[PDB]
Every structure is written in C-alpha cells, then in structure tokens.
Amino acid sequence: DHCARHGEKLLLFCQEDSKVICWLCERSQEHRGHHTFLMEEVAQEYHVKLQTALEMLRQKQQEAETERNQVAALIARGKALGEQTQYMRELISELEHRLQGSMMDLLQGVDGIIKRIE
Amino acid sequence: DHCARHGEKLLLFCQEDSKVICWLCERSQEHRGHHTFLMEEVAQEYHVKLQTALEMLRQKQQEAETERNQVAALIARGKALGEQTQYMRELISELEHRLQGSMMDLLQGVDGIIKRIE
Amino acid sequence: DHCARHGEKLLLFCQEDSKVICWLCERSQEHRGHHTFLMEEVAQEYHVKLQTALEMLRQKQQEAETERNQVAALIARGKALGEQTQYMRELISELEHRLQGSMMDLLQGVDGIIKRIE
Ligand SMILES: [Zn+2]
Ligand SMILES: [Zn+2]
Ligand SMILES: [Zn+2]
Ligand SMILES: [Zn+2]
Ligand SMILES: [Zn+2]
Ligand SMILES: [Zn+2]
C-alpha cells in the first residue's frame, strides 16, 4: 500500500500510535521519537497473540453457554451471562476479521483490541 | 526531484551544508554526523523567516524612499541610499521568487540568502 | 540488484555479517544493532586493500618459487613451500575474481578473505 500523506510504501509500524506508516512518517515531528518496527515482523508477532486470544475466547464462550444452560438471583446471573456472551461474540468476530485481513487491517488499532480483551 | 549522485528522491535537508539530499546522501561519509530534517518541515520553517524578512525589507525600503525623498554631504547620502535601495530591490525580488517557488527552490542555498539579509 | 526477502535495492553493507543488504534488512531483528555502511563506499575501500594484498601476494609468490628452485630436511622445506605456494595460488585467484566482480561479489564474505590473508 501507499501513504496518503507522503505516497511511500507502508512498511513500518508505529507502536505508540499503533498505526502503519512509512519512513518519512517516522522522521516527521508527528512520529518523531516513537518506536517503529517492520510491519511484517510485528504482523507475525501480533497474529499469534490474537490467535491465542481467539482460542481462549472460544473456550470461554463454550463454558459461558454451558453455564447459561445449567442455570436454566439465578435469573440475574442468566442476564449478565447473556450480555457477556454477546460482548465476547463481537470480540471473536473482530479477531477473526483481523486474522483473515491484510497486515495493515490487522495492526491498525491492535492496541484498542488488546485493551478490549483485558 | 531526483539525486544526481544516487538518483533517489530529494526529501531530506542537511543543515550544515544547507543542501537538499536523499537518505543515501545522509548515510555517506560526506554528510555523516550532520543534522538532517524533512524537506517539508524545514520548508515551512524557513518560509516564515523569509516572509518576515520580506515584510522587514519592505518597511526598510519604504523608509529608505521617504528618506531619499526628504534629502531632495547630503548628496553623498543620496547616492549611497540609492545603491542600498538597489541592493534591497534585488533582495526582495529573490525572496518573492523563493517564497512563490517549490520547497526545493526555497531551501537550496537559503544559507546564502540569510547571510545576505544580515 | 534486489533483495530476496524484501525486494528492495541492495545498497547497504553489514560488517558483522559481512553481507550486502537493504534498509529493511537493516531494520529487522536479524541485523538490528549491527554496523552498516553504504555499499559503494565500502566497495571502494576494500578494493584498494585487496589490490594491495594482491600485489604483496604476487611478490611473495615469485619469491616462494625462487626459493623452491634454489632448494633444488631441505626436502621437507621443499614440500611445505610447495603446499604454501598452492594455497597462495588459490588466494590470488580469488582476489582477482573479487576485484573483477561486482561490488556485491567483492564484499560478500570479505571478512573471510582478509582473515585468510592473515
Ligand atoms: Zn507517510
Ligand atoms: Zn507514531
Ligand atoms: Zn543522494
Ligand atoms: Zn551535510
Ligand atoms: Zn531486504
Ligand atoms: Zn548484519
């Protein structure tokens, strides 16, 4: 891909901004001093973490459905378990989208995703 | 633009040499250790200084014309004031040319321009 | 030339790996922290050292052939002198190959060559 501001290849990844950028972006005062990595290397790095969180979330979801079934203030526990199961469902959806997308789609905003997991 | 020595894009600016260069030029022993910036950032920086110097030079020119008019060894002061008015006349033209030109045309040799102002 | 891993130009030279690489290779964890130079400058630098070592090795070889001829445990000295003359023959051949080859072929493994000279 190519940068909107500069038109150069998007091969670097800024951690603080959690945003893909080119070298010229790295040298500007906007991203000056930040820590920047190679897009491919960080892509391999985060892909594993989001996959792991995907398996963990799937297990937790199966357990949540089992618990919700067995429950059938038990009603309150059922409701809260339902809302939680929904939130997890959406999270899993986003993780699958990122894992099947391009490296840029995966990295852009990964900080927010990992914050959401925790 | 493209580099004569290397053929790469001219996107960096070396302060010590006050010359626009590419990354390969930055990494050579010729410009090794110098401080280099992004052409756009230093372009915005110097544009303001040459604009300010433009206003200042215009004021000094108006005042010079007023003084020369009122003078009309006062004659010697008239002649010298005339020569000065000529030099400034050229300087203002150069400042407008640079300010209305591209970033490269503005930065190339700006050191000599600012040296001329002072 | 172009990089196998990344497809970018091979314009840099890693001293530790004594290997020509592109910028992306420089920023990977593989070559992170290493000392990297411009390929052309180090090529011009090493060309002179291998040329000097070439002349020196040629002189030493002529002297070695003269000594081996004059020898005709002197026999043991003849044998060892012969083996040495062979090793030098191969070294000189490699030096000529590198000096007439491309910058990459010259630099790739130059550390091993200079170690072989000594
Ligand atoms: Zn950019
Ligand atoms: Zn940044
Ligand atoms: Zn250059
Ligand atoms: Zn310089
Ligand atoms: Zn590479
Ligand atoms: Zn290396």
Residue numbers in the entry:
A (entry chain B), B (entry chain D), C (entry chain A): 95 to 166, 179 to 224
Which passages does the manuscript contain on this structure?
Like all TRIM proteins, TRIM5α consists of an N-terminal tripartite or RBCC motif (RING, B-box 2, and coiled-coil domains), followed by a C-terminal domain. Higher-order assembly of TRIM5α requires the B-box 2 domain, which is thought to mediate three-fold symmetric interactions that connect coiled-coil mediated TRIM5α dimers into a hexagonal net. We therefore engineered artificial constructs – which we call miniTRIMs – that retain the integrated B-box/coiled-coil fold of the full-length dimer but are more amenable to biochemical and structural analyses.
A P212121 crystal contained two trimers in the asymmetric unit (3.26 Å resolution, R/Rfree = 0.26/0.30), a C2 form contained one dimer (2.1 Å, R/Rfree = 0.18/0.22), and a P1 form contained two dimers (2.3 Å, R/Rfree = 0.22/0.26). As expected, the trimerization interactions are principally mediated by the B-box domain, burying 578 Å2 of the available surface area from each subunit. The B-box packs against the N-terminal end of the coiled-coil helix through a hydrophobic interface (asterisks), suggesting that trimer formation requires the presence of the coiled-coil. The Trp117 indoles in the trimer form a channel that would be expected to have a highly negatively charged hole at the center, which is likely to be partially stabilized by the positively charged Arg121 sidechains. Comparison of the trimer and dimer bonding interactions revealed that the two oligomers are distinguished primarily by intermolecular packing between the Trp117, Leu118, and Leu132 sidechains in the hydrophobic layer. In particular, Leu118 and Leu132, which are located at the outer edges of the binding surface, are in van der Waals contact in the trimer, but more separated in the dimer. In context of the trimer, the three coiled-coils do not contact each other and can therefore move independently.
